[PDB]
Amino acid sequence: IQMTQSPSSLSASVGDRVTITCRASQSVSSAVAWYQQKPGKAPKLLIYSASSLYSGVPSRFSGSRSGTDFTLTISSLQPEDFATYYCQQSSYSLITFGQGTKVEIKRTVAAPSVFIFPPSDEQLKSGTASVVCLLNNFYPREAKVSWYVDNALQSGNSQESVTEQDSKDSTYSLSSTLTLSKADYEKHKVYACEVTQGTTSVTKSFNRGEC
Amino acid sequence: EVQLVESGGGLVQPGGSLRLSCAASGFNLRSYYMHWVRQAPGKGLEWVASISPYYSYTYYADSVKGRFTISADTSKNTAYLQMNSLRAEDTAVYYCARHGYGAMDYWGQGTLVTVFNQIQGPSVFPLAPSSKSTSGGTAALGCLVKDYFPGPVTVSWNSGALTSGVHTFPAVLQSSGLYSLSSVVTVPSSSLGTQTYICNVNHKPSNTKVDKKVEPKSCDK
Ligand SMILES: [Cl-]
Ligand SMILES: [Cl-]
Ligand SMILES: [Cl-]
Numbered sequence: 001i002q003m004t005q006s007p008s009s010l011s012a013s014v015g016d017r018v019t020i021t022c023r024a025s026q027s028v029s030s031a032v033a034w035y036q037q038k039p040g041k042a043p044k045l046l047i048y049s050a051s052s053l054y055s056g057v058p059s060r061f062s063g064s065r066s067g068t069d070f071t072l073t074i075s076s077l078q079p080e081d082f083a084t085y086y087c088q089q090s091s092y093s094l095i096t097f098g099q100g101t102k103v104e105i106k107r108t109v110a111a112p113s114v115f116i117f118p119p120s121d122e123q124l125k126s127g128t129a130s131v132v133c134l135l136n137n138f139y140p141r142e143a144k145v146s147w148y149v150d151n152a153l154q155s156g157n158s159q160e161s162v163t164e165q166d167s168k169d170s171t172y173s174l175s176s177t178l179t180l181s182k183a184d185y186e187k188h189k190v191y192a193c194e195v196t197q198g199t200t201s202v203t204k205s206f207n208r209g210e211c
Numbered sequence: 212e213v214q215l216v217e218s219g220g221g222l223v224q225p226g227g228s229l230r231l232s233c234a235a236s237g238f239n240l241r242s243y244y245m246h247w248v249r250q251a252p253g254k255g256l257e258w259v260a261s262i263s264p265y266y267s268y269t270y271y272a273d274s275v276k277g278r279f280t281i282s283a284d285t286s287k288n289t290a291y292l293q294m295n296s297l298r299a300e301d302t303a304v305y306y307c308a309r310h311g312y313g314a315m316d317y318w319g320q321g322t323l324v325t326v327f328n329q330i331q332g333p334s335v336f337p338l339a340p341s342s343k344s345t346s347g348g349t350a351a352l353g354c355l356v357k358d359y360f361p362g363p364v365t366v367s368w369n370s371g372a373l374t375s376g377v378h379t380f381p382a383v384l385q386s387s388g389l390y391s392l393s394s395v396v397t398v399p400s401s402s403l404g405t406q407t408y409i410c411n412v413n414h415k416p417s418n419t420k421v422d423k424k425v426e427p428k429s430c431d432k
Contacts, residue, residue: 033314035256042306042318043256049313086256090313093270095246095258113397115344115351118428120336123355132338134351134395136378161380161392173378175393177355179385206343211430 001025003089005098011106011140016077020101022087024068032070033088034063036081039164043086047072077103105170109198112138112174116193116204119185129185131178133193133204137171143197145176150188154178213237213317217307219291220322222330222361222416227297231322233290233307240264240283244310245290247281249303249324252362253381259305262290274300294324302326302361325361325416331389332417333359335410338395339428340403350403352425353395354410358387359417366394367411403427 002025012018022032030050035043045054047063050070060075074081082105087098112135119129135143141162147154158178165172176193185208192205219231233245247259260271260281269281280293290307304323308315338353345351356364366379379394394410412421 031313035315037256042308042321043315045311045314045316052312054312054316088256088314090310093261094272095248095261097248097256097258100255113346113349113351115346117338117344117353117355118341120339120355123334123336123357126334130336130355130357132353132355132393134353136351136395136397159383159385159391161383163378163380173380173395175378175380175395177383177391177393204343209431211341211428 001028001089001091001094001096003087003096003098005087005101007101008099009102009104011104012077013106014077014079016106018074018077018103020072020085020087020103022070022072022098024070024089027068028089028091030065031090032063032065033090034061034072035086035088036083037086038083046085104165107139107170110137110139110171111200112136112143112195112197112202114193114195114202114204116191116206118191118206118208118210124182124185127182129180129182131180131191131193133176133178133195135174135176135195135197137166137169137173138197139171141172143174143195145174146194146196147176147178148190148192148194149178149180149184150190215307215309215317215319217305217319217322220305220324222325222327223294223297225297225299225326225328228293228295229297229324231292231294231305231307231324233292233319235288235290235309238309239285240288240290241285245283246308246310246315247290247292247305248308248315249301249305250321251300251303254303257303260292261310297326299326327361327416328388329360330416331358331360332419333357333364333412333414333421335412335421335423337423337425338393339425341428345400348400349397350400351395351397352408353393354412354423354425355391355393356412356421357391358385358389359391359414360389361416362390363415364390364392365413366392367413368394368396369407369409370411373408 034047050065382392
């Protein structure tokens with residue numbers, strides 16, 4: 001039984017009304033629960049039996065069932081309630097959860113500061129060269145990073161990592177790392193990190209053995 | 212006080228065996244259903260196994276059947292998850308939780324199960340500021356921590372004095388099986404000649420400490 005959860009993510013403001021839905025794959029009766037989890041802490045039981053409030057949880061929380069549609073709602077979102085939420089069904093014996101609903105903070109758009117880092121000479125001793133591109137404090141999350149070595153667009157030799165939303169300005173920051181062989185790096189010259197985010201494209205570049 | 216204290220987690224080799232403990236105090240254990248649910252780093256919640264209070268009829272998730280074994284003992288009032296034929300998919304924090312009102316009320320703190328073939332300490336490389344790292348009065352610098360296994364590495368800057376502007380990214384799995392991450396900080400450009408910047412990398416499974424003073428790229432000509 002697949003608990004399909006929607007949406008995967010959304011951004012609202014404090015005081016927004018917020019609704020998270022979860023649709024069972026076959027009828028689970030009303031045997032459903034809701035949990036909240038904040039990073040590095042265990043889940044907290046929020047709603048049990050689709051609609052009944054667990055004792056101690058705030059009253060802006062509530063749930064509801066219509067057929068196989070289970071819904072969680074916060075009537076007026078408070079800062080403490082920014083987290084990830086999970087539904088659960090407990091029918092018969094095999095337990096399944098929803099994929100997750102990350103509830104993030106809305107803020108104004110922001111372009112990233114784009115910084116590029118050539119490999120260090122220490123690293124080349126190991127025979128591998130790492131080029132790092134940093135996209136700093138932007139909103140919202142969506143960003144494309146393209147890598148160009150001597151004008152040749154790379155694929156397969158980069159990886160990206162994104163921070164969670166910042167605890168103060170509610171931006172994201174992303175890094176991309178292009179991994180080349182030492183030999184491959186020392187035969188080419190111009191290394192570029194092209195960033196597209198929002199209505200903004202930024203290219204940062206260096207030539208091997210520069211400065 | 213009803214307490215759910217977990218133990219037994221640690222590093223383990225593939226197709227091996229490790230035992231987690233879910234010590235229950237306060238309540239009787241054989242009076243409520245008990246479940247293990249796990250969470251691979253950066254992923255969702257996955258139920259693993261359950262044990263019934265009367266006559267200890269057990270049920271497991273399809274993914275773990277026949278490899279994991281759940282057991283209980285009322286003498287110690289603790290439930291165990293014996294994990295056998297351990298896979299890399301099993302790397303996760305494992306929680307234990309008690310069933311109450313068709314769901315799960317109390318939880319353990321969670322113990323980490325880290326699968327691993329061999330332990331690798333990290334190489335740490337500077338991400339040096341330069342004219343290709345300086346925009347709008349701000350210079351970026353950082354530390355590249357590469358080729359370690361398994362997690363975690365923790366990064367601080369200047370022993371925790373430097374905290375604002377810091378970004379330590381989630382670790383990524385390189386196609387080599389070894390982990391890699393970077394920790395960066397943005398600082399005012401003028402500070403580059405006023406302050407030293409040191410990243411403090413800590414990788415407990417290899418008992419490696421590294422401290423890297425990150426300096427502006429020295430120009431050869
Ligand atoms: Cl977490
Ligand atoms: Cl250079
Ligand atoms: Cl390994």
